[PDB]
Design a protein around this ligand. Structure first.
Ligand SMILES: NC(=O)C1=CN([C@@H]2O[C@H](COP(=O)(O)OP(=O)(O)OC[C@H]3O[C@@H](n4cnc5c(N)ncnc54)[C@H](OP(=O)(O)O)[C@@H]3O)[C@@H](O)[C@H]2O)C=CC1
Ligand SMILES: NC(=O)C1=CN([C@@H]2O[C@H](COP(=O)(O)OP(=O)(O)OC[C@H]3O[C@@H](n4cnc5c(N)ncnc54)[C@H](OP(=O)(O)O)[C@@H]3O)[C@@H](O)[C@H]2O)C=CC1
Ligand SMILES: NC(=O)C1=CN([C@@H]2O[C@H](COP(=O)(O)OP(=O)(O)OC[C@H]3O[C@@H](n4cnc5c(N)ncnc54)[C@H](OP(=O)(O)O)[C@@H]3O)[C@@H](O)[C@H]2O)C=CC1
Ligand SMILES: NC(=O)C1=CN([C@@H]2O[C@H](COP(=O)(O)OP(=O)(O)OC[C@H]3O[C@@H](n4cnc5c(N)ncnc54)[C@H](OP(=O)(O)O)[C@@H]3O)[C@@H](O)[C@H]2O)C=CC1
Ligand SMILES: N=C(CCC(=O)O)C(=O)O
Ligand SMILES: N=C(CCC(=O)O)C(=O)O
Ligand SMILES: N=C(CCC(=O)O)C(=O)O
Ligand SMILES: [K+]
Ligand SMILES: [K+]
Ligand SMILES: [K+]
Ligand SMILES: [K+]
Ligand SMILES: [K+]
Ligand SMILES: [K+]
Ligand SMILES: [K+]
Ligand SMILES: [K+]
Lengths: 446, 447, 447, 447
């Protein structure tokens, strides 16, 4: 039977991949959606397709030795998982955070395959990063770390090979140091090697805003599917980094009010809305804690207690990290009348959180659909670079809006095609999978 | 201790490291004078040894070029490629074959290339190269063999993303063909983006011939609008009658202005109702004759041998002939006659005294650095066409060139005002070319 | 804090970075115990984060290996290459195809290999690789397709100066042939130095087949002579029945000892009157059969699936199968029954409890990184022969191997004594191997 | 049409192409005087523009070397590699890190290197490189970071068959370690043959440390014996106190001579009872202190800041410091005081006036391209060891070195005499060095 075939393969996978719970978590949800497609179209398991799909094409782990400002040598671990290249070059971000390990990178890279497929743009899936902690490091220490990291990474990447970008801990600053050092290693100005670049050295307008903006563009599409208006809505946006910052900005441009945001230290309550300019100054100039925002803003309350999800909202947009919204937060959310969740972060909702949303009739936008705005805009940066062109903000934002609407459409149409109307998780996973699978079938056993 | 003191200290050290290169010294001194204004407002532009990095080429290649003449005699020349700065894109800049070429000349021109290319707003870095090979008196086969020997070494250092050379004195379409053909032979690939100035049927761009002349006129049109005026119905002088002047005349008249004079080394022509571009080209390209031959045949146009083209009463003067062709006396004549606008199509045609006269007399001045950048802009457009495997129409390309020139003007105007020098386009051009490179260098780290 | 504390704290951190890899933790733990001793005397050895760099692989590659079986069914296995340390030379170490393989096991092997390779005195860094592919039951064509898929990825990461693999469990001459053929196809060149354990007519070395087992016996003979005994007349257990075990048995019996038992993973054979090497070779190499078949065919040999081979009373135990095959209970049984010498042909066959028993019970114990190093030493001789396009005689190469094993023993004994742990070859091996690598690492900077 | 006129006309052209490089002109002029002697007997040596090709480097690289000091300040130095001639082997020659370094100095050294390398009889072309980086006062980490930045560019231009650098002034074992480590990191392979002067545990050669100084003494011994004298009991001046000077002192005293003075750039020390090698090594290698500190801590040794080391009465002078350190005035003094032999450990230490005085006063003179060749010869032996993956004994290597220096002497004396310039080892060295290179260039065609 199909259900048992897939369950028995998942079991095999758990054995080969012992101790990688985030990867198991990512895989599990996808294969659950894959069961549906195999019942209708069995050829999708032909030629060991699922066995190939779930094993990364290549994984790199490497030493990153570097020297701090006191002349002390440090060693961190670097990673690049090149998961699938059926649709185009490996594509996906780099995360510098002390939590990072191979299992986490594999989870992100596996998800990235289906996210990138969903954009409709020609990009395969990958991810990388390091257990390096950028917090408390000088710009020179960050620079030397990025240079050491790229000293190994450059041989494994390239405009058609693998195109990284930022993620947690890797912003414009780091992409700058990584790109410069890549050019030094390769002796060429290969703009297409990375995305997230600066506007004067091959970057794209809107890329900075893309993930957070598209998240909101997606959530507004789920909201308007219920005959509702995002204007006038109360929104929680967890996190205070690249994705959260611009999610808040688009949200409040659209008539909504963001009532809370957070970092890993705690969360701040803003019942009358966020000052974007203030927050950007605290986070980007001062690289400070959100409590400083509370300290300086009238009526902003810093919290170290409870959770940001204790706030009454109509919409929640988790934009920080994996497993930041759990089963209990999900209940608290629905009890206070939350109506839609859409993920800016990668895999922020736990499995039981997702279960609650279903039980409680909360419309749920999965990250691989909702946050695809980032990588889609990265693919647009790649397109601009490929043609040595530079697009306006308006034109690029318009394309991003079109892609997000296309992703919504695909999720809706496929979910309904397989008898799971309005289940966007089912729609996203099946639609992302089928395009990859068809390409893999066409390109043979490789 | 002070800003002046630290910069002067550095310039002194540059002199010592770069002994015997006075042109490069002077080019660097001119840049350092621009940084002073910048540092005064924002010191961070000298952080992380930015100036010390900027003034040292990323890489310099010098190499033997052995070749054999038609009589079987072996000759040895020296080849050069200075890859100065790649912060904004691949190294970009021409190749010159002339006995005067040496490393200091190449470094000088390569350094200046960085900022001119930056100022276009397009993703190109800066470099320069060539050889002391003298093409004069050489046969086509001798020049081919030289180009082939030259590129046997050069090919390994260049590439669509690495370094994209072009022509200059001694390196025209003929040489670009021989260099490109041999590059493909060495590399075993048909990499169109390795060079610009290529033939139309093998990766070249329309508007290349017209670019520098057209761009000068686009630039001056923006200067004119900035004063509440329009270029249509104005009277314009265009000096010279070569590549730049021909196409400067063509565009100005397209935009509805009337051109009243042109010239060669020998003399100058008054054409009070307009130039016959078709006639001029025939005279100069087909017949390779003097401009006197022109005046005979047009009813209303008169030739002149005495005085100067700059005696003519005009609204706009576009010197498009040669360095130092417009002196302080000329500048005075123009201003007295009511000329309100000068923009340079040629290389430094206005003498330093002429430049001060425009300032004194309130004539708006478009320096060549900005106004004659159409040629380099179109080189970037060739790269863009090659990158997308497309060959654009004349009209589309010319439209893109106009947008680029408009943006160069905007950048000059905005930057000049930013630094307390409203409407001083030389200040604007100098500062804007530097700051874009500097910002990109800061972002990309110590490399 | 105390060296003990510092090293223990570092180890704790390593357990966290490398969760779920007990064999890697085991290998690291014993080396770090010896390193405490060297650090107590010469603390400079921790300078510049040397230990932190040493215990973190330079590079690790994991990759998909898709292949098609004889029924046309697609299978997917995982491939690995850990390139641990290159201070002393190219990464060097074998490839293991066994269903137990995972990244933790490959890391343990690669880590051990650094020090083993250092101890040979030859210029070789350390690495290891393999796959969870199970070669048992596969046809030659299936093995071939697997090796070709494996090398389709591996080739870009290896090379005569980059990384030089070889066999290990499940990878013998058959697999090396298919791996080498396909490397040449991928690289388009006949790069003999890319692999060792090659066939004699395409760049292999005489003695390499025999080397690990011969070397193990040469090493244990030195241990025995150091105690004033001699190997002739002794009873020896040799576990396993593969490449290492076969030639340990051959050399042991040449030197006048009698091998009283051997095994595979299914069971063990008691051979009270010694082993017929020719019969064992026919069974294992031709028939690829179980050791039970030897017992069936040989008068006086008995097959067992009960108990352990380590239940046999012996003078010398040579575990030659795999990691953790000789445990604390086995060690006590061996000791109680009169075993006086243990030398490891396998990598890490003795569990930590077993090693403690040997220490406590005064059993002389030759760690794998010393006793089994004859294989990789002879691989380096294969590399030397290839580099010089020479082919040495069996007698010359075997003489070199004898001198190396004697040198390794002398290094372990002297280093152990130097550091106040006389006759502790674990301490001697780890310290001597570490110092050479650490010196080379200090000289070569932070890389 | 006369040989002098032919060669003189070329020199004039060399002068204009290489303006501002007096040391390079100095080195070329003296070689060209020898080529006139060659051409008078064998005019074919100028065929196919051979001399024009010989005197122009095949390739020259100049590059930015940005690095960060311990206080986090960015510095920029200039790096060079001149790849002069590769007719006989890969480019070969050292790296000089000193504030005096510029292209003309690198060119002089690279030019000399061609003929020196030729004379060794071993398969090595000629090159040189360096930087104006001053290693004096820098921390180990600063030196490491500089080397790593230097090699980040240099790696793409070097390699076992391409270009093999080594040390020279300011570049010792410490630097070579950091350069080699970083090269392996850039190339991702353990390519031992990329550099010489490597450490003993990572592909170095025994004798290389001692080789230049030892070889200089071996050479001067041959000069001495040729005059019917012997080295034992003689009084020797050795200028400098670095790698070359140190081992010239060691070998000279091992052979029974007394070294009565050495120096650094600050002053000289008088040692009438001979030098304590171990002490000098301590002061210079560990403490990196001044020679004056030797005089402080050693009874009988006196430091001088007046006069020159060259006014010590000696039998033998070995200049072992730098170019142009022994002038016409020093040469006269030496001779007046009874000096009979001079042999150059340094490159081009004797000025042209000094060399005329030696001739005029019957002082036998060994030019550096002969006398100092032991260093590069032993580098070639390191390359041979690496190529064959062998490591030779000190005794074997030193005996090869002895044979090479005797052969170089014989070649110089025999060639000098063949051309009618008996005992002129400058003519002998230049002609013998040149002919081997030229014959190989003729065979390899116009490239
Ligand atoms: N940037 C992009 O283009 C895209 C990003 N994403 C995903 O969106 C999420 C955020 O990315 P991005 O905004 O770029 O990263 P940033 O580093 O710019 O911001 C991360 C934010 O989340 C917080 N955070 C990080 N780790 C944790 C944690 N372990 N527990 C609680 N909070 C944490 C950070 O706070 P603190 O300072 O206290 O650590 C910070 O406020 C990630 O899941 C990322 O994978 C998805 C698509 C695109
Ligand atoms: N074309 C381009 O894209 C580029 C142009 N430039 C600069 O632009 C200027 C012109 O370039 P280009 O048009 O290509 O050169 P051309 O050779 O095509 O044309 C030059 C014209 O200037 C005339 N001329 C020279 N000197 C004088 C003078 N003293 N008084 C009046 N006329 C004179 C020449 O006449 P005559 O036949 O009698 O000599 C000829 O008519 C130069 O300063 C050049 O360096 C620089 C780079 C590129
Ligand atoms: N070959 C070399 O040059 C060197 C090998 N070594 C080490 O020597 C040992 C043997 O290697 P080698 O002889 O080359 O390998 P082979 O594959 O030729 O032989 C392995 C033998 O050990 C038995 N064995 C393997 N795995 C297990 C297991 N998990 N449990 C019980 N028995 C097992 C096998 O029996 P079965 O068929 O039932 O699996 C077989 O008899 C390994 O530790 C290896 O790393 C060390 C240095 C060099
Ligand atoms: N090393 C080699 O293998 C070979 C080197 N050579 C040549 O040998 C010479 C020395 O090289 P090497 O010993 O390796 O370099 P080192 O840097 O090890 O030592 C150079 C020595 O010369 C001293 N010195 C520099 N200038 C003077 C001066 N003007 N008067 C007196 N002493 C001075 C330096 O003193 P201070 O510290 O004050 O600068 C230092 O004691 C150079 O000409 C080199 O090109 C030739 C062949 C081989
Ligand atoms: N960090 C990203 C964006 C990746 C990208 O732009 O390649 C993500 O999709 O998680
Ligand atoms: N399997 C080996 C030897 C492999 C080799 O010869 O490189 C080992 O030392 O474990
Ligand atoms: N510094 C040296 C030795 C160079 C080398 O060993 O390649 C010289 O010959 O000048
Ligand atoms: K690459
Ligand atoms: K393209
Ligand atoms: K190229
Ligand atoms: K390879
Ligand atoms: K015995
Ligand atoms: K039996
Ligand atoms: K190289
Ligand atoms: K004597």
């Amino acid at each position: 039977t199909v259900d048992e075939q897939v369950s028995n393969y998942y079991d095999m996978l758990l054995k080969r991949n012992a101790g990688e719970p985030e990867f198991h978590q990512a895989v599990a949800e996808v294969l659950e959606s894959l069961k549906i497609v195999l019942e209708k179209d069995p050829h999708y398991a032909d030629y060991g397709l699922i066995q190939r799909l779930c094993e990364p094409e290549r994984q790199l782990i490497f030493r990153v030795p570097w020297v701090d400002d006191q002349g002390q040598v440090h060693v961190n671990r670097g990673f690049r998982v090149q998961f699938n290249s059926a649709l185009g070059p490996y594509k996906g971000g780099l995360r510098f955070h002390p939590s990072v390990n191979l299992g986490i990178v594999k989870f992100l890279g596996f998800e990235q395959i289906f996210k990138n497929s969903l954009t409709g743009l020609p990009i395969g899936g990958g991810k990388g990063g390091s257990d390096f902690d950028p917090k408390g490091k000088s710009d020179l220490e960050i620079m030397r770390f990025c240079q050491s990291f790229m000293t190994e990474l450059h041989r494994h990447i390239g405009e058609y090979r693998d195109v990284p970008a930022g993620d947690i801990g890797v912003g414009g600053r780091e992409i700058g140091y990584l790109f410069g050092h890549y050019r030094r290693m390769a002796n060429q100005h290969e703009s297409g090697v990375l995305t997230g670049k600066g506007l004067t050295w091959g970057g794209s307008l809107v890329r900075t805003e893309a993930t957070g903006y598209g998240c909101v563009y997606f959530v507004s599409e789920m909201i308007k599917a219920k005959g509702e208006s995002i204007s006038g809505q109360k929104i929680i946006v967890s996190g205070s980094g690249n994705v959260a910052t611009y999610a808040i900005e688009k949200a409040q441009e659209l008539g909504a009010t963001v009532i809370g945001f957070s970092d890993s230290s705690g969360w701040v309550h803003t019942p009358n809305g966020v000052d974007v300019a203030k927050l950007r100054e605290i986070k980007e100039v001062r690289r400070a804690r959100v409590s400083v925002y509370a300290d300086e803003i009238e009526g902003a309350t810093y919290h170290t207690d409870g959770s940001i999800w204790d706030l009454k909202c109509d919409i929640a947009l988790p934009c920080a990290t994996q497993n930041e919204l759990n089963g209990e937060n999900a209940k608290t959310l629905a009890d206070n009348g939350c109506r839609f969740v859409a993920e800016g972060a990668n895999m922020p909702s736990t499995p039981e959180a997702v279960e609650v949303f279903r039980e409680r009739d909360i419309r749920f936008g999965p990250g691989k659909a909702a946050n695809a705005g980032g990588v889609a805009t990265s693919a647009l940066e790649m397109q601009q670079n490929a043609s040595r062109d530079s697009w306006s903000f308006e034109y690029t934002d318009e394309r991003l809006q079109v892609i997000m609407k296309n992703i919504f459409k695909t999720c809706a149409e496929t979910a309904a095609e397989y008898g799971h109307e309005n289940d966007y998780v089912v729609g996203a996973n099946i639609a992302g999978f089928k395009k990859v699978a068809d390409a893999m079938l066409a390109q043979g056993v490789i």
